[PDB]
Every structure is written in structure tokens, then in C-alpha cells.
Amino acid sequence: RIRIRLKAFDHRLIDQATAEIVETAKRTGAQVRGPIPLPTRKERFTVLISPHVNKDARDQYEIRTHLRLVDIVEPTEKTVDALMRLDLAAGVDVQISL
Amino acid sequence: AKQSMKAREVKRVALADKYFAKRAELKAIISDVNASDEDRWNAVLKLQTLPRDSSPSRQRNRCRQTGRPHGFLRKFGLSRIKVREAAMRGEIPGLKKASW
Amino acid sequence: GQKVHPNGIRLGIVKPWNSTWFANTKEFADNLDSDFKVRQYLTKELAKASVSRIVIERPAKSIRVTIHTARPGIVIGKKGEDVEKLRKVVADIAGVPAQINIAEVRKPELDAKLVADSITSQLERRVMFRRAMKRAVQNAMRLGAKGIKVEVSGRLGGAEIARTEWYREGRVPLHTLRADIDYNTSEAHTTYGVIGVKVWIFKGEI
Amino acid sequence: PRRRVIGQRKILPDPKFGSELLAKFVNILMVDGKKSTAESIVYSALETLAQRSGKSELEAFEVALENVRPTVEVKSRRVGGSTYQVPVEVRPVRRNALAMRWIVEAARKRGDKSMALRLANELSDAAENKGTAVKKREDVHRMAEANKAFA
Amino acid sequence: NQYYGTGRRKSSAARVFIKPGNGKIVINQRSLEQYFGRETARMVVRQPLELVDMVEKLDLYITVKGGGISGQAGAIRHGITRALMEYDESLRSELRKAGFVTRDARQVERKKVGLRKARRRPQFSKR
Amino acid sequence: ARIAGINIPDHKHAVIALTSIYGVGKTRSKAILAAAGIAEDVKISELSEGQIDTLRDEVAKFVVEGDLRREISMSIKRLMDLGCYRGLRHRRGLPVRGQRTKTNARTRKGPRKP
Amino acid sequence: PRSLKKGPFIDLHLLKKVEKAVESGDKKPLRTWSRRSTIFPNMIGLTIAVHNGRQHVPVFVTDEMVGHKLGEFAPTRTYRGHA
RNA sequence: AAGAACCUUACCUGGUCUUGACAUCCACGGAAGUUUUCAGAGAUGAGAAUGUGCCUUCGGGAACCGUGAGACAGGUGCUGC
RNA sequence: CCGGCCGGGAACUCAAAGGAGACUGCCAGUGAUAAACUGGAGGAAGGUGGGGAUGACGUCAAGUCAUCAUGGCCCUUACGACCAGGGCUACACACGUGCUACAAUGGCGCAUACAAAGAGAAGCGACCUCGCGAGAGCAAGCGGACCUCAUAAAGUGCGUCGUAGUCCGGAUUGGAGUCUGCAACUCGACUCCAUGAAGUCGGAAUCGCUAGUAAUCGUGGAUCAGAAUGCCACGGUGAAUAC
């Protein structure tokens, strides 16, 4: 039972990552549960934009971290190895749970 | 922002990791619940006779670029002005202007 | 206080980021500081060599630095050899080993960092500022651009009272979020002080 | 406001015995965002009211509300700049609301053991024309009668 | 069988299953009286069943998350409206003329920057 | 109805009437009435005299009104005759626990005439 | 206040100084920059000149001073009156 | 100032250092580094041991640190008119 | 063992990607054959649906040379640098902005219900034991829709106080502590016991608010070793009035 838990900031980028993972795994012998959209984490920073006074002048930024779960059940060794040989993109962070 | 202060913070970090490896060991004698009274009093004094820098309550977490004490954020490790500059320039990944 | 940064909002809407990676709460400040160090180290050595921007990716515990330069043969030098020297500092100053690519700039009179470098270079050569602005504006509009606005602020001739002065030709719609506008500022340090050049270039709508 | 003639909101009809007037009275009575405690005060006022009248609670509320009710009021207006007090006729949806407001603001005084007993006193004293609500009404009617020259 | 309605109101989410039966109402393994005790949802969950006189011939199974008491009450009412809309398309025409069909959205306003609680400015003083 | 220092009220409950003594508050009166076994609800007027004496000795266990006033005045005088910092703050009529002295402290500094 | 399980606080240099003054047996003052040190019972009867920021004020350790810090008997801010 | 017990800290009293706490250069050496003591409020001042590594022109070269001169370094010092 | 607890289900809440929708699109009336307005239908939504981001040319020679950068002056055994202690926390007074109150729409005690958003690795720290409590001990889980912070509070039901400076208020002060931290005197937060001040709705004046708003109730985060009544966010209940 291998679960591929992968995070990214850009959601159009993380669609592509889980797409290549589900395609390569579902190619040769795996009954995966597919992409699971675990909730996006919105992290908000309020910063002051003046170098001095004017406390009321402020900017609110956010980092949105998108989670995607892929659940391989009935695994195969060439599926997990040909999954490992992919180096999809910079911007996605993968964690394979054995 | 006074290069001597950046030198002071980098002096404190260098003492901090080393005598923090020593300090977490020697600080456990004072307050476990039941070590002794002799070694409690001994550990108090030997904890005192370390340099004051190498206590991690003495660092300020200054900014990396300007070295500014106030307005710090721990996520980026910068001050607020340099976070705004790097966010507008696009240097920080995934940081959009939030509106909701 | 006016005028939010154009790239800073089209980061979300249109323009791509300059950094493309992911980090947890631990690795974020270290990655960000290493990226700042490699940008400020490449900045001078290719600020003689007409650079515009570098894009840092962090794939698989390594750093990947794309350099968008207007003179690629000056960056690569003889046989690409100078780029290897860049690798043997960046793979040092990033920690992780380096892979440095050079992306070309097709028309260097449409990339705003290069135009700000041009006007600041001319202003440090003590030319008249209006000659530099009108030459850059006419060059961009005659090479084909939907709009350009240059703006210089500072003492601007050698002058006790400092003023701003700008030129637009074409349309520069800053409120249109679906518009493609690239903007950069640079600083010209002359003997009277600092003169700041902000240039906006509108290329079309996305 | 300045421009619009914006339409009024709709309040919920009453749970116990349906009336928009009773719901408006509860809404005028409640302070600090507490609808339930004011509803309980109104109900334990109107349950100890219909026994001291014999006429039941909605009708005792209606003609106890009638004796404190304005038909003209005083506004301030300018013609030349002297800025004096003029009489003007009132709206019916304004006059019932001004009645409820006068009853509750007179019932905040005459302190008794609880607010429900205070409403039980002041609804009855207004039903028999000697409360402070009808005294405020008689003040308004006297003041708008004394200035009757301005039409 | 089962006719489903969903009702959201003020961050409350209710899901209602209406069926032919008794007058008994079940809500999170509880009755109506032991879940809501005050004026609201002893009345407002009765209102779409009070417009068309069918309180006795149908029974409900309601499960609800989110919000508070009156928000959950309006969520259940808006869900019972959809659940009774699953009965007959003439019912929505008969109860469109009294409310109950609109989602009644009106979420809380986010706290604005510089202000105190999204409208209240903090105490301007000239000198 | 007569606990050696003072008199207690008779129409209050026994907890609240016990709190009239200098030296007991809510918790100490609760503990005293829990030891003596009187319910907290009943008034003083329903109590009887043997039960008032079995209240009296438990109030006599603690330090109460007279020697408590002696103890407090002796400690504050000990501070003021010590020469410590809290002694000087007790002297000049200023806040002792490090409070704001610039703006507030209108309890310790007295009502504001000037 | 400190915790009770930690014990009372004194500097090591002040403890060495007061034990040197006990084995020496003299009653000559000693000037200290250790305001954060709790007064110990062996220090009773010898004047200690505690630093207050400018000068060293000499305080005489009595029996009643045996709980407090040394700096509590050395005022730092001077104030006489606004008139 | 999105947070003054020390730090922060720019302020004051006292004790100290000068190519300097932060950089580059030049000459001479010493592995760096670790433990521990005494004096001192501490900065510092004095030691006593331990280790001696990498490529090798291997009298050397990279980090490290000490000493000496001069360019210099440093200034939260002034003018946001 | 009735606990989504387990098989299982892919309906529903939800999660996130992708679309549809709202455009004066339709109808009537009035207007210059117009733009538009007024009303109505359907529609979850009605006319920029609500909110945010978005700040034109310029004004104040507005603010910052103490975030940074910088032209010019000034200092160089000193205005540079290191350290300990102090101070930034003082206190006859004046103002600005907030918090808590003056109570019965309330205080206290008991029982019970309903949230959203967020943080967590030299960190969040279950269960159990000890302590009146702050907390201590031992200690699983968790880089998290899993685990923890973390029992939401107003509300509700019963009792009690019966309008007193009072069972209101909780300042001040004494004693005893806990925890972080080399170190809590100057000068931390909290706990428990005792104390129980002013204050009974506030002068001339003056502020905010047009609907899920004002008001009221709690929660969370950043900075942070420790230290919010501030700031930034989040939900519960929830008005009145506009001629």
C-alpha cells in the first residue's frame, strides 16, 4: 500500500503532477484510487507597507498549498519503480508512503 | 543597520549551538524532579559559568538582508519591507496578493 | 503612496514567478536566502553582460538557474567556459550542486530591465536625460510595442530641487489585469546623487 | 439617505401568537443582541397583563398602545433662518413604532423587581392614561398644539 | 420513498430527507423539542409545512452541521423547501410567494484592515 | 450571631453572612461551613446556638480580624522600616507591584486635586 | 519569584567573594555588580556596596534582609519632587 | 514596535581596544579545533594539557586563527529643504 | 460493547479542480424612432447581487537619510568597538485611543446544546497519576481533513440573591506559589487565600454605524524562550431608523 502525498503552490502545476502519476501508475498493473483533492491550506501574512508610520497602510498576502493524495492499492514493482524514475517538475513536492 | 550588530548576532549563534549541546545536558540536573540537592546547586553554578551569549534567549532573529530587529517574520526569515519587495518582484514562490 | 507594483499583482493573474519550488516551514528561509545570494551574485557579473532576470528552480536537491540575457555570447564567452565558472560558484553558494542554463532575449528593446539598464547607463555617462528617454521610447515603439512609459526621478540635470519627468507613447493600461505589462526600476548613481528609472512596457492583452 | 427610496425589511411574524407589532416590540426592547431574553420578558409581561385587564394579551397590547399614540409631532425646519419648531403629521407605521419606543423608554424607569414587572406596570398605566408613556404623548401633543400656527 | 433537500444558511448545512408518514420529526437522533428550545425552529421548520397543510402526512430525517441555533434553523427550513419541491413543481409556485425559496445568503462580512469589526472605525478625533 | 470580633447579619445566608468577618471570603466561608456541616442555603436566623459555637471555634482556627490586621500592618511597617524598594513605594504612596505611574495609579496616589 | 525546586540564586563570583570574606573574617566592604543575587544568611553583618547605575551604595545585611535580592536595597532612579 | 528583565539598545555610569567586532590586500609562523584552571562584574589577562587532518611544488597550497604597517574599515552622526 | 464502530456504499455534508448562471437577457409602461428609468415574470441570486484587491494627473518643498540605498559635510587612541549594571517602565500634571464596570435584559452554583478559521518539530503535546489551582510527573500520536492546542462563550433549564454600594464592581495591598529564562529587585505572566478603592449611566462638547451592519459573546494567529485590554483574522446571537 503506497500512498503518494504531493504538495505544490500552483494548482495548474499540481494537476499535471498527479496526472502523470495516475497515468504512469494506471498504465501497467495498479488499481489506484485516483487523485484525492485534500484541502488547500491558505496561509495569510499581513505586512506593513510603509517604512515608518501609517499603520493603516497594509498588504495581505497568502501562500496557498494544494494537497493531492494518490492511493495505490494492488501495487506492482514495475509500477512503483517507473513511478520513481519520473522527475516531473520543480514546484511539486512528493512523499511516497510505503 | 550597524554591521557590529550583525557581527554580534553571528557571534551569539556560534556560541549558541555548541554550548546549547552542553546546556541541555547540564540544565537537566536542576529540574528533573529528583536528581539531588548537591548536584542541583552544582548545576546552577556551572550553568552560570557559561558565557551569556550561548543562551538562545539572547538572539533577536534579525532580518537576513538588512539586519533589522523589528518587523521580523519567521517563515521567510526577512523583515516586512524586504518581504514586500521580494513578493512584488516575484522572488518569493506562491505568494500572491490575497483578497477574499 | 500610490500605484501598486504591476508584476506584483499579475504574479497571480498573468506573469509567472521568478522562483519555482516548494519548501516546508524549515527549508523556506534557507532556500529564499540562497536564492537572494545567487541573484545578487549573478547580478553584477552579468550587469556588465546585459542580463534581465534569472529564474531559480529547485529540482531534487539541486539548483537550476535560467539566465535571461540579451547578449548570450558574452555570458557564455569562449566555448561556454565562463558559464562553468558560474557553476563553480553557484554550486558553492547554494549548497546543493548547480545547473545553469542561458535563455536568450529576442528583442532587447522590449524587456524592461534592459531598458532601465540602458537609461541608467546613459545617465551615468552624463547625457541629457530627455535624449535617453526619447531614444528608448522611440526605439520600443518603432520596434513594435503596444505601449511604453518611461519615468525618471531625481535631480535629473544636476539640480538642487529634484523633479520627476515621464514619457508615454501608446497605451499602458495598469488597471487591466488581463494585460501583459512588464515593469522594472533601476538606479543611476551620478555625482549629484541617485536618479531612478521606472519603465512600463505593455505588449498586449492575455 | 440622499437619493434612494429604499424598501423596508420584513420582520418575522411572532412565534406564540402572530403579530408584526409584537415582533417589533421585542426588537425595540432587546439590547446587546439578545432576542430570546427580550422575547421572554415580553411574554412574561403579556401573560401577567391579560389577567389584570380580562381582555386578552394581544388586544390589551393594542388598546394599551392606543392611548400612547401621536397624531402630530414637532420637527425643526428653516424658512428664513430662525430655525423654529413646526408641527407635522406622523405616519401610521411611524406612530406605532414611536408608541412602542415611548413605552419601553418609560418602562426603563419606574424601577421594579424585574423588567417584566416594569412592563406589566407601564402597559396598564398607559392603558388607564396615567403612565409616563401617555405623559410623553401629552407633552408632544401640547407642544405641537402650542406651535399650531405653522402649517 | 425518500425525497431529499439541502439547505445552507449562514455557514449552516442541513440535509433533510422527507418521506410519507407520521408527524414525528427526527434531528441528529433527537426530536425537535430537545434539539431546539426557543422560538426559532419550533416555528421556522414548521413554516414550509404550515404554508401547505401537510404536517401530519410526512415525516422528516434531518442531519445538520455548522452555525448556531437560528442559522441551523434557517438551513433546515431552506432544506425542507427543496425536499417539498421534490414532491410537486406546483408547490414551489405556491411557496415562492412567501419566501422560503431564496437561499438567504448574507454571510458575515470579513474584518477590514484598519477598521475594528468591518464597519466600525476607531474614534476619529480632530485634535 | 456574635463572632468574637464583630456582629454578623441575620437575614443573609450563612456563607454571605460569614463573609462579613475580616479574614474570610467566599472560599474560607465555604470551607468553614463544610467543616461545621451547615448547609449553605439556610439563613443565620434559623441556626441555633450550639451550632453557632461549632461555627465559632472553626472561625477561631484561622487568623481573622484582629491579629490579621496586626499581621498586615506589621508586615507593611517591616517593609517601610527595612529600606527596600517596596518599603519606599509603601512610603511615598505609589504603586508597589510595578504598575504604571505616569498616567494611572489614581487609587494609590489618591483622588486627583491638582 | 523563582521556583522552589530551583533553589536560591546567587552568582558564583559573589559566593566566592563572600566565602573569601568569611575565611578572612574582616568587615571591609566589597563592591558588587550583582543586583540579581538573593541575600544569603552567611552575609549578615558585612556591608556590601551595590551598584545602582552610577555609584555603589553600601547596604548593611541585617537579619530581616535575608530573603530579598541585593538590588532591592539599592535605588536606581532618583526622584525628589516636581517643585 | 508583528511584543524594552539581560539581548533588543541606538541612551547613562564605570572598565577596556585600536587597521579594529564586520571586509580585501601584504610579511612571519601555528593544523584548525576540544577540555580545564586561576584572576576579574565581565570584556579581557594568564596559562596547563589534548589532537596534528586533506592534495601534495610536498621549504608548499585550501580552509582556520595569532602578530605588525598602510590603504582602509566603521558611524542608528547631521541635512527627507 | 450501538461508537460510522466494522464490513461495505459513492447517495448526501464536504474537499478541491472544470463548467453553467446574471447579461436590463425577457415582459409592460414612460421617454426625443434613443440612452435610460419604473414595475413585473421566471430565477439561489436583479440590475455595477455582497465584499475585497485595484489609488488617474497632481497637492501637501506631507513622512522616512533609524529598514535599505545615496550626494555632500563631520569623527578616526573616537560620534568607531567590547563588556557589566542601569534606563527606555520615573510622576505634582494634561490629552489621545482601548479594556472593565456602575448591575436584576443581571451576579453565582448545577446540568446540557450549537461554530468557523488557524497553528504545530530544539514544536503541539492526548490518556493516566499528583496538586485547591497555576502547573508537575510519566508519556502515545503528529510535519497533520488522521494527532494535539481545544471543554466555544453568549444561550438554555432549575435554584438563589430581592435594589443594597449590595452575593454589583474587582482596583489596590499582604502572604503562599508555579513556569519560562544564566537571571523575575528595578521590571514578567498566571494561580490560590485574604483585602474590597473609585464608580449608582457621566459637564460644555464629541464619535462610529444603512443589514448579517451597529451592538454583544467567545475563538485563533503573527511577533514570541516568557510577556496582549493592542493589531490581524474567524464564527454565535443579532437590531432600530432613513420623512
Swiss-Prot record, chain D:
GO terms for biological process: cytoplasmic translation; negative regulation of translation; ribosomal small subunit assembly; translation. The strain K12 sequence is shown. Has been predicted to contact the N-terminal domain of IF-3 based on footprint studies; exactly how IF-3 interacts with the 30S subunit is controversial. It comes from Escherichia coli (strain K12). The gene is rpsG. GO terms for cellular component: cytoplasm; cytosol; cytosolic small ribosomal subunit; membrane; ribosome. The keyword Metal-binding does not apply. One of the primary rRNA binding proteins, it binds directly to 16S rRNA where it nucleates assembly of the head domain of the 30S subunit. Is located at the subunit interface close to the decoding center, where it has been shown to contact mRNA. Has been shown to contact tRNA in both the P and E sites; it probably blocks exit of the E site tRNA. GO terms for molecular function: mRNA binding; rRNA binding; structural constituent of ribosome; tRNA binding. Belongs to the universal ribosomal protein uS7 family. This is Small ribosomal subunit protein uS7. Changing residue 35 to A/E: Defective in ribosome assembly. The keyword Iron does not apply.
